[PDB]
Amino acid sequence: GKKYYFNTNTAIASTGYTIINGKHFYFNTDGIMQIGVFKGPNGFEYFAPANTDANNIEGQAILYQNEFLTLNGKKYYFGSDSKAVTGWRIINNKKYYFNPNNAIAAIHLCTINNDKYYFSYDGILQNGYITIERNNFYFDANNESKMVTGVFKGPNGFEYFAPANTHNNNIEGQAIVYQNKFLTLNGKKYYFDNDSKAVTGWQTIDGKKYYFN
Amino acid sequence: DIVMTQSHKFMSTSIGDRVSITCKASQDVGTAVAWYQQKPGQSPKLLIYWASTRHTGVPDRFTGSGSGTYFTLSISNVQSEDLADYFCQQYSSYPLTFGAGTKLELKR
Amino acid sequence: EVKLVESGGGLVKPGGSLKLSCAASGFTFSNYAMSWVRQTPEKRLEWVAAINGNGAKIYYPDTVKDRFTISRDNAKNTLYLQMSSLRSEDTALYSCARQYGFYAGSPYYFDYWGLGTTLTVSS
Amino acid sequence: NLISNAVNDTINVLPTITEGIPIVSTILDGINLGAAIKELLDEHDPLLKKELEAKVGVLAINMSLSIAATVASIVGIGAEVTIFLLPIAGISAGIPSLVNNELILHDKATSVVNYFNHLSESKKYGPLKTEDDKILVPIDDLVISEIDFNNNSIKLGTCNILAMEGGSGHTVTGNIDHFFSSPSISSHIPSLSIYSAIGIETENLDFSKKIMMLPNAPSRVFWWETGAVPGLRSLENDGTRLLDSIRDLYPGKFYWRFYAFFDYAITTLKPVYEDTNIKIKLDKDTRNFIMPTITTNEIRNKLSYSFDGAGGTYSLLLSSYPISTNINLSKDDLWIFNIDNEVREISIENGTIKKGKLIKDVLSKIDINKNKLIIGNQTIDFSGDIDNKDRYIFLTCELDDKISLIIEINLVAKSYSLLLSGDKNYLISNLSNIIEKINTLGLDSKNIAYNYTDESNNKYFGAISKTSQKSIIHYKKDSKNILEFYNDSTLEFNSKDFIAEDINVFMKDDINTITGKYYVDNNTDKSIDFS
């Protein structure tokens, strides 16, 4: 049940990328032929099963362009040149990120060039107020949909998203409890309440009146 | 309400070929499409459910694929017993709509 | 083991009424959702009605509301379909099918199908 | 009482060797044990007589076809159950993590959806999945009774979830409800069951296959939270239909994904694991069981097995991780316990169970009582009929791929005895390694019996002494008696033709003794006994 190829002049089982009679085949390091998307000399190509397109055989790299692919629940996108797209990509005005190691769309929190991003269960980029593992985070849409720290609008008013190790062995971006204290970020001051939410109006603190927009 | 159109009403093939029946939906159904096989003078038998996996006892030649509005049912090796009707139907909404029909005939 | 036998065949005047039946054995009843289908010869298959496990919610399309109905009796393992106002367009092979429901009655595929009741209406 | 039994009983104190004409064997350390005790042992096999002869050292082997067939069935069941293997419990659903002492199970929305997708497989494959020759429970699906052996039905426990309080304004559009005030999870307003939403076939099941894996069945309540996670709205075409079934069955009391002001979904899933006891009712047949391996102590300690005792032939593969077990008994019962997972070092490599070499002195201390047997790290509780003096409990372990060690334990007499099996020539070749493995196990029985039933139904009977490694094997081939004696590698004696009747073989310490009846010059009237 395992297909192999041996060379006609040396009888050696090929264990990598192999070009046979003008067609391309990929093999595992034990010589067993495999079906999937693998890295070759040109790049990433799809090795389809037999007769998917243009009467091919098993293991042949085929012309697969401008459509998605899903082997084990994964997401592979192939460009016009029948090669898998890596890096950032806009597909139907939605943003997906495929790794340079293999063309896998990210599905959760991930570190992309020393920055944290959140993708949904099918790889679409998401914005707004998002929780991750019972801790409330924020991903600002105004600056390339990345993770931020500061004060932003949540579901029950504004909350403070602290940096790393700010209050009670904190983590970065986490909404924290901050009860009746003062803060400033870039010359702009904020005042919070008993329920750790920032307040807005003609508020008086220690007998001195303040106003917030 | 929802309608669902199949491509070819009649098609023919020989033993040993591969046949890809294509079904198209009016709107998005999201992998909620099933595949049947009605023998003449017999009840239909379900083959593919959730548009990707096969029923218990269905042979390995019946492979289904598709997500969105384009669903293909493929047979890896046509035999004598693999010559019957083939139906598609969405189940993403209460007015269930079935396919028109596709009879797999023998090329003689 | 699993069988679905149905006995409602006949010929009726247009504008009349008829009642179908569908017995079941091999599997426990009131656990699986049932439905009726209408296999026309000239046209495609037409799902006509469906009911849930305990007979709570019944679903019809626009051409079936206030025309047909399903009553289910769980004690005798039967499934009915009472018809009315057959306007010479219901000549089809009525079949009894078993859905993969859980409780509510939701759109699904069918596990097993009935053999068919050849019902036609004419003058 | 002593007055009554002394008047009733008569004692002869005059020095006589024989009175009831046996073939007497007064050579063994000057003891008059010859046949005046051994006829009572060989006629009806008393358990106290066997236990009190074990303190002298006498192992009288049994050549009865019922014992040989029982040993053959025991070694066949043990061989099959040892041959096929199975993974650990919570691979498909379970293995929860202990985070802040609350046992969180699933961390995210798609993991919760995949858990309910796995639980929806009881509608597809039934409440008991089938391999080629084994009935298997689904993972994290609790069944509480399994009276299915008698009247073909099982019963389900509780797997309910916490309810929900009221919301302000509820409208449904596109199968996603848009709230105006997000409702809250209440620990009061009692829980909502899931098994009322799954319609499980539980009254007509098929048990053609006689090997069953016992369930991982504690009753639990799923505490759960709700986060934002605004990335899923097209996930509804999945096994979310079970969640929608719970939503529609309990109207206003459960909502798994809503749109109050933001997107919301189930995020976590925290079980409770209250106590559950499973009352398995057995029947006449020969059902075999495999106890599951659970790697979490907080789920492992909330389980108990309560096997009934109808007149069959049952086996149970004990796992390395102990489960509390209660055994009900009756008159006719044959209980088998496979301790192969107990006498080997157990490691988890890729989710399965791989057995190590051996464990030193794991069976040196066998606490045998009238109603409780403790072996290794497991306690087995016996009840119902704990006063029968004609019932044995068998312990099986595979010392090799061919030779099996069977320990014959009687509860009320508090005795254990050793037997062997496998091919005769292989056992003679590997006898040194077999006794080395037994000494590694730590058993102190000096004489080991050996009953075998080879292919084409020819029986072997044996007796192996552990000290100095002497063996006697007597077997019948081609309608004649063959008798072999081994000094552990060499055939020191061999009678290919052995004309004798009523052959009985026993050892004392290292002294083999063979007795019977001989006819002088093939004359029936010239009958001479011999030892």
Residue numbers in the entry:
A (entry chain A): 2127 to 2339
B (entry chain C): 221 to 328
C (entry chain B): 1 to 123
D (entry chain A): 1011 to 1541
Give the authors' words.
The symptoms of CDI are instigated primarily through the actions of two large, structurally homologous exotoxins from C. difficile, TcdA and TcdB (308 kDa and 270 kDa, respectively). The delivery domain (DD) extends outward from the enzymatic domains and adopts an extended β-sheet structural scaffold that supports a stretch of hydrophobic helices.
The mCDIFA-248-25 Fab interacts directly with the cluster of helices near the tip of the delivery domain, predominantly with the helix containing residues 1246–1260 and portions of the helices 1118–1135 and 1204–1208. The Fab heavy chain contributes several hydrophobic residues to the paratope (Tyr103, Phe102, Tyr100, Tyr109), with the Fab light chain having a minor role that is mostly mediated by Tyr311. The residues contained within the epitope are consistent with the pattern of protection shown by HDX-MS; several other protected TcdA residues identified by HDX-MS are located adjacent to those involved in hydrogen bonds in the structure. The data indicate that mCDIFA-248-25 recognizes a conformational epitope consisting of three structural segments at the distal end of the delivery domain of the toxin. Expectedly, TcdA-specific mCDIFA-248-25 protects Rac1 from modification by TcdA only, with mCDIFB-8-26 only exhibiting protection during the exposure of Caco-2 to TcdB.
